[PDB]
Every structure is written in C-alpha cells, then in structure tokens.
Amino acid sequence: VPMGKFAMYPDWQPDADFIRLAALWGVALREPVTTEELASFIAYWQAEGKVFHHVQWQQKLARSLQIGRAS
Amino acid sequence: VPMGKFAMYPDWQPDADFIRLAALWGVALREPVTTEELASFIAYWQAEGKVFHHVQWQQKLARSLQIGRAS
Amino acid sequence: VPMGKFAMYPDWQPDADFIRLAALWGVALREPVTTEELASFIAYWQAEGKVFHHVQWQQKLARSLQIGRAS
Amino acid sequence: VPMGKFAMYPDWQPDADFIRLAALWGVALREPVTTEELASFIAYWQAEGKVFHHVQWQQKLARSLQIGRA
Amino acid sequence: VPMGKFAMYPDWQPDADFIRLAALWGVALREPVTTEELASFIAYWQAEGKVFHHVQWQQKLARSLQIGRAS
DNA sequence: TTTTTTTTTT
Numbered sequence: 061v062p063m064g065k066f067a068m069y070p071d072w073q074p075d076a077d078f079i080r081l082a083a084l085w086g087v088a089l090r091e092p093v094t095t096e097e098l099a100s101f102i103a104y105w106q107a108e109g110k111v112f113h114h115v116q117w118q119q120k121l122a123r124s125l126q127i128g129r130a131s
Numbered sequence: 132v133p134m135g136k137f138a139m140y141p142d143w144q145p146d147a148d149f150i151r152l153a154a155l156w157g158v159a160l161r162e163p164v165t166t167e168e169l170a171s172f173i174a175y176w177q178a179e180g181k182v183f184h185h186v187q188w189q190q191k192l193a194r195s196l197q198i199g200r201a202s
Numbered sequence: 203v204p205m206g207k208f209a210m211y212p213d214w215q216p217d218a219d220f221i222r223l224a225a226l227w228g229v230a231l232r233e234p235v236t237t238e239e240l241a242s243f244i245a246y247w248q249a250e251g252k253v254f255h256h257v258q259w260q261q262k263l264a265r266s267l268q269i270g271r272a273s
Numbered sequence: 274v275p276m277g278k279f280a281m282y283p284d285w286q287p288d289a290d291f292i293r294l295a296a297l298w299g300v301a302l303r304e305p306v307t308t309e310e311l312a313s314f315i316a317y318w319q320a321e322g323k324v325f326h327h328v329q330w331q332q333k334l335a336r337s338l339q340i341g342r343a
Numbered sequence: 344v345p346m347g348k349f350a351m352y353p354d355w356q357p358d359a360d361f362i363r364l365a366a367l368w369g370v371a372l373r374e375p376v377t378t379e380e381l382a383s384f385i386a387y388w389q390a391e392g393k394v395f396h397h398v399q400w401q402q403k404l405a406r407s408l409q410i411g412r413a414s
Numbered sequence: 415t416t417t418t419t420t421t422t423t424t
Binding site for chain 1: 236238239241242245246249250
Binding site for chain 4: 415416417418
C-alpha cells in the first residue's frame with residue numbers, strides 16, 4: 061500500500077490480521093470479509109476520492125461492515 | 132453519466148452490466164430492473180436533492196432493490 | 203497533566219479527571235470510555251500525525267464519543 | 274475590557290452585546306453563548322498559548338460557535 | 344485613501360476593482376466582498392494597531408478572504 | 415488572520 065494518505069483503489073486490501081484490529085476498535089466480526097463486501101467498499105470510496113492513511117481506511121471498512129451486517 | 136457528484140434526474144439509467152455489478156457487490160438479482168422500480172427510485176431521490184457519483188447511485192439502487200424485493 | 207504539544211501515541215490516556223472536564227465542556231457521558239473507543243481514537247490520530255496539547259486531545263475525544271454514542 | 278495582546282485565561286468573557294457584534298461580522302446566532310461552550314473555548318485557547326486582542330478573541334469565538342452549532 | 348502608511352479605521356474600503364486585483368494576486372473570488380467580512384477585517388486590524396499602505400491593506404484583505412472562505 | 419474525524423429510503 062502507499063505511504064501517507066491516498067485515495068481508495070481497486071486492488072487495495074486490508075491487513076491479514078484485519079479482524080484483530082477491528083476487534084481492538086470495538087467491532088467484533090464473526091465471519092471474514094467477503095470479496096463482495098470489499099469490492100463494494102472500494103467502489104464507493106474510490107468514486108468519492110477522499111484520501112486517508114491505510115489504517116484509517118481500515119477503520120472505515122470496519123465501521124462499514126458493522127452497519128452492513130446489522131441488516 | 133455526468134462526471135462528478137450529481138442530483139438524480141428523470142432520464143438517469145444504471146449501466147447495461149448493472150446486474151453483474153450488483154452481484155460483485157453481493158446483491159444477487161434474479162430479475163432485471165423494471166421501468167417502475169427505476170421511476171420510483173428516481174422520483175424519491177430527485178426530490179431529495181442529495182448528490183452522488185454514478186457508481187454510488189448504482190449501489191443505492193442495488194441495495195434498494197434488494198430490500199424492495201425481499202418484502 | 204502532560205505539557206506541550208505532542209503527537210498521539212499508543213499508551214495515551216485521558217486522565218481520571220476526563221469525564222469531569224467533558225461535562226464542563228457540554229458533553230455529558232453516562233458510562234466511562236471503553237478500551238476500544240480509546241484504541242480507535244488513538245489509531246486514527248496517530249496515523250494523522252497532528253500535534254496538540256493534552257486538553258485539546260481530550261476535547262477531540264469528547265466530541266468523538268458524543269457523535270459515536272448518538273448511534 | 275482586557276487590554277493589549279494576551280493569552281486566554283479562565284475568567285475571560287466576551288462583551289454583553291457580543292451577539293449583535295457576531296451578526297455584524299456575519300455570524301447569526303439564534304441562542305446566546307452557554308457556560309460550557311465558553312469553558313470549552315477558553316480551555317482550548319488557554320492551552321494553545323497564542324495571544325490576541327479582546328475583539329480578535331471575540332471574533333474567534335464567533336467563528337467557532339458557527340462551526341460548533343452545525 | 345490616506346497616503347502613506349496608516350492604521351485601519353471604520354470607514355475604510357478597498358478599491359472598486361478589488362476583485363480584479365485579488366485575481367492578479369492569485370485569489371479568485373467566486374463571490375465578491377460582503378459588508379460583514381469587511382467589518383470583521385476592519386475590527387481585527389484596527390485592534391491590532393499596525394500601519395500599512397492602502398495596497399498592502401488590500402492584499403491582507405484578499406489573503407484573509409481566501410483563508411476565511413476555504414472552509 | 416487562522417480550532418473543529420465521520421456510507422445507508424425502511
């Protein structure tokens with residue numbers, strides 16, 4: 061992944077231990093991140109064009125899965 | 132088809148491959164979009180006046196159909 | 203209380219006086235800060251790189267909890 | 274009013290006609306300034322250490338309340 | 344209007360072509376100068392007590408409006 | 415002259 065802030069992009073992936081991190085940020089995920097969930101996240105934010113650090117992007121991904129899976 | 136964010140408008144349409152996209156975002160559609168579902172979505176969001184990129188609109192349409200057809 | 207501006211770092215804590223100050227600043231919290239809320243706050247601002255006085259860091263944490271918990 | 278350039282301090286207060294000043298400077302305030310809003314402001318800038326004239330401090334409070342109430 | 348350096352005073356105004364100047368100095372004002380922004384600028388600098396040439400005052404206004412409207 | 419973290423018709 062790039063250093064510093066950057067816009068979301070198609071082959072981006074969170075860290076292997078992403079679920080661990082999400083737990084540490086108060087989001088307990090039962091099942092792993094599916095290819096579809098990630099593709100949808102990336103599409104949305106790639107369009108938006110805002111820029112963030114890798115770890116902030118992962119925080120956005122966790123918050124998004126939490127809302128996504130409540131429904 | 133405008134570039135950038137835009138408010139929804141009456142002759143708006145999702146891409147021709149919309150059904151495959153929806154699948155890639157984790158929305159499996161067994162029926163194609165109807166002119167009535169699309170008019171309903173457009174009328175709602177046109178009034179609202181909120182602005183989004185084309186791809187984000189298409190995600191809103193996918194989510195909206197999922198919910199709508201579940202009922 | 204720590205002195206001078208400083209970047210956010212992993213072991214940072216707002217003092218035991220934090221809930222008190224938050225109330226003096228118009229943010230009334232029912233329950234204490236969770237390890238997770240804090241971890242999440244730290245991760246975000248540590249990546250951001252910005253530098254602040256302790257009290258200022260505390261106000262940002264208060265504002266964040268207020269928003270966070272409104273959901 | 275406090276004189277010269279100065280650092281923010283606990284007992285600081287804007288003028289009684291602060292509301293109308295804020296309007297003159299393009300910040301239309303529906304309600305008056307609360308105790309907590311002021312304590313929050315004062316804490317922030319007291320830590321920061323920067324020094325300003327009283328009126329400038331009042332302009333900073335006006336800009337801040339605007340942002341804060343949105 | 345006064346020649347040479349002078350302290351800011353309540354009735355001060357910039358030139359009628361102030362928008363064109365501001366563009367020459369790199370500040371493109373999508374909107375012109377409001378009476379309020381002006382009073383705000385005057386109260387600030389009148390308090391500050393510094394003296395400047397008319398054209399220097401006009402540069403301070405222009406830089407100011409740039410920063411003030413960047414929000 | 416510079417205080418202001420935030421995907422979801424239901």
